Amino acid sequence: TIKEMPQPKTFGELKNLPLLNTDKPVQALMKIADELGEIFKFEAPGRVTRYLSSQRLIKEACDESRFDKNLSQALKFVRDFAGDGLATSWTHEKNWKKAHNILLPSFSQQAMKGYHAMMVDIAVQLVQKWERLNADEHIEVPEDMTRLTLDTIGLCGFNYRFNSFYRDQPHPFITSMVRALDEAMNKLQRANPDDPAYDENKRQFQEDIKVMNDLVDKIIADRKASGEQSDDLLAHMLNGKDPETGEPLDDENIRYQIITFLIAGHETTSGLLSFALYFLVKNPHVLQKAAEEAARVLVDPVPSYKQVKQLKYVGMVLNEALRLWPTAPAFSLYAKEDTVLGGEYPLEKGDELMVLIPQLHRDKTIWGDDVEEFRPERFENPSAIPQHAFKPFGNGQRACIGQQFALHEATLVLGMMLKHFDFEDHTNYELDIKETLTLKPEGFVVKAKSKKIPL
Numbered sequence: 386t387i388k389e390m391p392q393p394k395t396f397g398e399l400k401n402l403p404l405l406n407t408d409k410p411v412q413a414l415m416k417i418a419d420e421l422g423e424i425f426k427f428e429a430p431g432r433v434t435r436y437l438s439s440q441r442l443i444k445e446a447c448d449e450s451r452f453d454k455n456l457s458q459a460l461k462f463v464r465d466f467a468g469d470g471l472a473t474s475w476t477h478e479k480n481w482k483k484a485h486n487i488l489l490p491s492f493s494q495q496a497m498k499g500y501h502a503m504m505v506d507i508a509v510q511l512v513q514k515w516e517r518l519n520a521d522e523h524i525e526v527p528e529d530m531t532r533l534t535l536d537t538i539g540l541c542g543f544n545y546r547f548n549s550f551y552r553d554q555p556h557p558f559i560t561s562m563v564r565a566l567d568e569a570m571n572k573l574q575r576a577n578p579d580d581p582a583y584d585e586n587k588r589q590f591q592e593d594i595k596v597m598n599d600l601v602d603k604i605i606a607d608r609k610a611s612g613e614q615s616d617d618l619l620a621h622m623l624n625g626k627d628p629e630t631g632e633p634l635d636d637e638n639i640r641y642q643i644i645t646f647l648i649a650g651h652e653t654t655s656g657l658l659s660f661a662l663y664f665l666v667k668n669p670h671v672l673q674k675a676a677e678e679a680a681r682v683l684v685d686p687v688p689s690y691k692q693v694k695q696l697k698y699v700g701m702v703l704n705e706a707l708r709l710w711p712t713a714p715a716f717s718l719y720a721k722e723d724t725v726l727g728g729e730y731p732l733e734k735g736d737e738l739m740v741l742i743p744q745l746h747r748d749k750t751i752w753g754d755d756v757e758e759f760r761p762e763r764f765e766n767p768s769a770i771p772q773h774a775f776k777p778f779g780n781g782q783r784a785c786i787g788q789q790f791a792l793h794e795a796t797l798v799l800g801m802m803l804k805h806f807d808f809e810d811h812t813n814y815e816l817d818i819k820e821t822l823t824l825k826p827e828g829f830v831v832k833a834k835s836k837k838i839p840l
């Protein structure tokens with residue numbers, strides 16, 4: 386009962402490699418999944434993986450007794466600046482489990498109560514920016530959402546203000562972070578990496594690692610010296626001990642966690658807010674329902690933590706945006722031991738799988754025929770969703786540690802935006818999804834007309 390896997394078109398000795406040599410490789414893989422179905426083999430010189438798209442097979446990929454997290458080539462390149470922080474570590478590295486145990490209490494739903502006031506500080510800066518636009522002016526949506534998420538992670542994470550709303554050119558740390566992510570990603574499509582064409586890329590990459598390390602190491606040192614007692618992510622790492630080994634993180638690994646929280650959280654969360662606003666302006670009845678909830682619930686000039694927990698329909702809007710365009714759209718696994726997937730695909734120890742999340746979230750056997758419609762009400766009875774059907778935050782012990790942070794920030798911000806403004810898709814925007822490590826609607830712009838409600 387061994388079934389042979391489909392495979393997309395090949396390019397002689399390059400196998401399937403040239404199919405990823407494209408501006409939008411995840412969108413290209415989705416089309417291949419539409420043509421080939423729930424599983425297909427993908428070969429490149431010296432490597433193979435199998436792309437999975439159905440809930441039936443991903444339910445089994447998510448079995449942690451059989452499969453563990455693999456570092457994709459993209460995460461191996463990001464590792465050159467994120468080191469052994471949580472997202473770029475293997476599960477078997479000592480620093481993965483130590484940092485996971487130390488940081489988990491700082492990321493819980495209960496922990497969000499202590500970060501709430503500083504998330505509101507940055508959210509009120511975004512609202513005031515928009516209130517202060519002139520009549521003719523419009524909003525660059527991903528750009529302003531990115532200023533917000535970076536500043537919120539910097540403030541809530543280590544008490545540092547990047548002051549992105551005071552700037553055209555970002556803080557030099559952010560410029561270096563973004564240029565290092567961009568070079569790590571560009572390295573995936575680089576035939577001759579030692580060509581002299583890339584000498585400047587190499588020099589600038591090392592310069593950017595140094596800018597990041599120098600700022601973050603200085604912030605850690607300033608804190609240790611001052612002895613200032615705080616309760617932010619940096620405080621928890623300075624003070625915390627892993628209950629298992631009894632050891633704290635060392636200062637180098639703390640620096641890698643801080644850089645990881647910025648890289649892992651900034652564009653995924655700004656992409657989520659950008660797609661959510663895109664889908665609301667494209668579905669005015671849904672926008673009106675979400676705006677009615679915001680006006681009902683957010684009765685004070687500043688939202689409270691409790692009021693954010695009552696934005697239930699806004700939370701469903703965000704889940705439905707994550708269903709259609711999950712902003713960290715794939716994750717990689719390897720077989721811990723020889724095993725058979727789905728009763729028909731034998732795998733050897735070490736074989737790789739790729740979970741293609743946007744295609745999982747379009748599985749009609751789970752969601753029904755209307756998978757392309759934006760309908761938040763499909764999250765009304767979440768106990769009915771089968772296991773492992775909805776995976777925007779990854780899987781198991783290697784799932785997103787920042788999930789509660791991301792969702793509380795996005796619910797708070799989207800709530801305030803709907804309370805304070807009416808929106809206009811003034812250009813009749815044509816969705817264009819730019820791919821980096823994450824997804825975003827490039828060039829999405831709106832006009833916001835103030836409801837003139839004070840802060």
Ligand code: HEM
Nearest residue numbers: 471472646649650653654713716778779783785786787791
């Ligand atoms: C909506 C926004 C977000 C999405 C969709 C998202 C998605 C994901 C996914 C899919 C993974 C698993 C990656 C893999 O298996 O290779 C992951 C891991 C991770 N994310 Fe998030 N993320 C978001 C926001 C955040 C934020 C705000 C933070 C930090 C505050 C964060 C920090 C991390 C970390 C540290 C990991 C690694 C955890 C571990 O392996 O122990 N993420 N994320």
Ligand SMILES: C=Cc1ccccc1
Nearest residue numbers: 472649650653713785
């Ligand atoms: C949080 C997004 C993300 C994406 C890839 C690896 C680790 C985290």
